[PDB]
Amino acid sequence: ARDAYIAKPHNCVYECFDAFSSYCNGVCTKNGAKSGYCQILGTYGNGCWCIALPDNVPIRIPGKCH
């Protein structure tokens, strides 16, 4: 229902940093209301967090991006 480390469609964020530049929120901002923040990727790097309940089909991949 929500994204954990992904903020872009089928692509993931290389490394979300401080949201001071609203970089992570900026990606979630495109929705026009969706809200997201930058957390940790999990192992190494950073991950973007986005909250909302689109029509459906939130995450279709283990979170790994090309």
From Swiss-Prot:
Q: What is any one of the record's Gene Ontology cellular component terms? A: extracellular region
The LCN-type CS-alpha/beta domain is annotated at 2-66
What is the annotated tissue distribution of the protein whose record heads this document?
Expressed by the venom gland.
Primary subcellular site in the record, as a coarse category: secreted
Q: Which GO terms describe its molecular function?
A: sodium channel inhibitor activity; toxin activity
The entry's free-text remark on domains says:
Has the structural arrangement of an alpha-helix connected to antiparallel beta-sheets by disulfide bonds (CS-alpha/beta).
Q: Report keywords, A-Z.
A: Antimicrobial, Disulfide bond, Ion channel impairing toxin, Neurotoxin, Secreted, Signal, Toxin, Voltage-gated sodium channel impairing toxin
One GO biological process term is: defense response
Under which name does UniProt file this protein?
Sodium channel neurotoxin MeuNaTxalpha-5
- State the remark under miscellaneous: Negative results: shows no effect on Nav1.2/SCN2A and Nav1.8/SCN10A. Shows a weak inhibition of inactivation on Nav1.3/SCN3A, Nav1.4/SCN4A, Nav1.5/SCN5A, and Nav1.7/SCN9A.
Q: Which organism is it from?
A: Mesobuthus eupeus (Lesser Asian scorpion)
Domain of life the protein comes from: Eukaryota
Query: What biological function has been recorded for the protein in this entry?
Result: Alpha toxins bind voltage-independently at site-3 of sodium channels (Nav) and inhibit the inactivation of the activated channels, thereby blocking neuronal transmission. This toxin inhibits inactivation of Nav1.6/SCN8A (EC(50)=790 nM) and drosophila DmNav1 (EC(50)=280 nM). The toxin (1 uM) does not significantly shift the midpoint of activation at the two channels, but induces a significant depolarizing shift in the V(1/2) of inactivation of the channels. Has antimicrobial activity.
Q: What family is this?
A: Belongs to the long (4 C-C) scorpion toxin superfamily. Sodium channel inhibitor family. Alpha subfamily.
Q: Which cysteine pairs are joined by S-S bonds?
A: C12-C65, C16-C38, C24-C48, C28-C50
Where, per UniProt, does this protein localize?
A: Secreted
